Symmetry: D2
Subunit: 215 residues, 4 copies
């Protein structure tokens, strides 16, 4: 078991907010859950679904055949920096500095969302959930880069999409980068209080290579 | 049938380099495995990486499990088109479109490729791509068409990677055909034989549709 | 010369709709003003907004002041190519490329247009654009070509705007021609006549190169 | 709307996981569209990336507007505006910035966030290879009650080559009911007039003038 805490300070379309989160799970299982709580006295004035991934690739089931960059980074752990570029021009950048101290994995997270159409599903809180996703990961320019199409189910039954790019960088000196692989993800908000003042979310994630035969 | 013949014609223009390919092959559309041999028209070598047009050379060839509706096989006898962009890390973009028809006993693809803004010293124009990695395509209905998103990772001759984001619109020519539910297609495309200058290429693609096999809370 | 005739042929495919235009016109390349008339081949209307292909239909027609190197006129008699993308706000992307030649007294563009991923309910496929606004193109030499970046604003019937980002690579076919310094081109393109279905269009472009007139340098 | 407006600015930023904070002081003439700022990096460590990508973080109130173009920014006063912004660079780096601008006493204050991500570690930003940004033309158009500006950015590198980005900014007045302006452009020239090692201190000036198209019509 690995205890997790997280703090996010964010600004999305000039709306400032902060969350604290607590949770954890078995990092080897690739399954963990967090409860986040909004600081302050304002409901969150946009879709929380665009910040769910701000709230630890240490929680990924890695099979023996794939180098686990994230667990390999410990005790120094990693950072990441990330953008999700959405179909309507909105972009959220997020960054996290993850530390493992006092037997807790902590994420110190920034989120900065810009250029969301005021009438778009993000600012109008029209996202129901994000679909499961496949992240494609490759070493490049000395960091690990993941690309992940994101599909968000909207209240009207349609989809809103984004492309996520993440740079993951170990803080362990000279840690080898892993080989090309994928991570399959399912993130679900299992509990949501009005205005996203409290959210419980779970992420399941498993690393894998291609199942398909050769040629 | 478990046996489907394929023909393809591609005309293309990448950074103002015009080219044409003819392709012939086939495979098992139900198994999601097929191969094609392509032949470059004219006497000259391809002046850019063929790897960026491999996907121009048939989603009919996808293993679909019974849990997921097969839009592509469902489109037949009218078949489909698709239109597509790959946006590369260095600003190069290749657009491709195909009109797929089924006639006599052959699935034909009539393909356009138009690649622009590739850095002249970039891996595409300098022909520095070795191969493309397997890929996961995420597919969803969007504004009445099926849209696939697929990160593309290209291994370079220097051992590094070059990436692109692919977006494809798939549209059945069978009017009113329902779109499938959200799903994924896993792909592995390999150039199994390459003649110098990409004057001839043999390529195979394996593709299987799947949903998420992760448990749910 | 103060009068230069133009001929253009465009073959295009936008969301799998194929079309061809022929255009003729001309103007004063030194004044940066010219107009052409395009005519759609065949009897069917254009199934999308012609406004996204207007720029397919000659940077030779740019007023260049003495202190800015004129890459386009400088390329003559060999002339230039260009390759171009417009990435629109809703994910539609049109690529275009042109090979420009000069065979005496006429300056001739052979153009490809390939537009993909336009939402079927978007302003392009629904023909909702009424005009494009004037534009500023920022140009810099990059990796041996001239690169222009130009925000595009399209006015819609409903009074709102539809946006795109245009990137163009311009490459002289005159061997060893130096690239110009950083500069801008201001543009105004207007469709002065439009027949139903865009079967015929008259369009004019005014273009003038400039540097920054603000103080400091 | 007087010919001298003092400005203060605070920016907190995080670019490729490098955190920093700047305080800035200056001002200028909002009507001539010219002002300058002195920024000071908090702490003793140098800025680990090119300051040039955050220059625009450090007030569209300072724009020369001719009579025929509505001045959304000065029109927002005393409530002022916000803005939120991205610059998408050629190599995939993206910096988002946002500012809340307030007018209290004389001073115009900007409270700025900067969050830069996905900059290639050996790219010109992280390797501090940018010399300057070129002058720019910003195309502005109202959409959805927001003024959107698009601005190609060209950064000159130490080797004489260019590094480019596309800037998109949303500007939103905090004056309720304020009309949006018509389509127009703003020409900009931003110069770092002074730079101390590690970008510990920078003086920068911006000149900006709104204009429409002066080309003939058919």
């Amino acid at each position: 078991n690995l205890s997790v805490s997280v703090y996010m300070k964010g600004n999305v379309n000039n709306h400032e907010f902060e969350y604290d989160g607590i949770g954890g799970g078995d990092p080897n299982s690739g399954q963990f859950s967090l409860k986040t709580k909004l600081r302050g006295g304002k409901p969150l004035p946009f879709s929380y679904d665009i910040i769910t991934m701000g709230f630890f690739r240490a929680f990924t089931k890695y099979p023996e055949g794939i180098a686990d960059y994230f667990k390999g980074s410990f005790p120094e752990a990693f950072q990441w920096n990330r953008r999700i570029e959405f179909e309507d021009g909105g972009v959220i950048n997020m960054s996290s500095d993850i530390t493992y101290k006092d037997k807790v994995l902590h994420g110190d997270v920034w989120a900065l969302g810009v250029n969301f159409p005021p009438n778009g599903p993000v600012m109008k809180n029209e996202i129901v959930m994000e679909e499961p996703a496949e992240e494609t990961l490759t070493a490049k320019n000395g960091v690990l880069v993941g690309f992940c199409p994101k599909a968000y189910l909207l209240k009207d039954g349609s989809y809103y999409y984004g492309h996520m790019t993440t740079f993951y960088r170990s803080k362990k000196s000279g840690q080898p980068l892993p080989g090309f692989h994928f991570i399959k993800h399912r993130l679900v908000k299992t509990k949501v209080e009005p205005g996203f003042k409290m959210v419980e979310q779970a992420e399941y994630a498993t690393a894998h290579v291609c199942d398909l035969p050769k040629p």
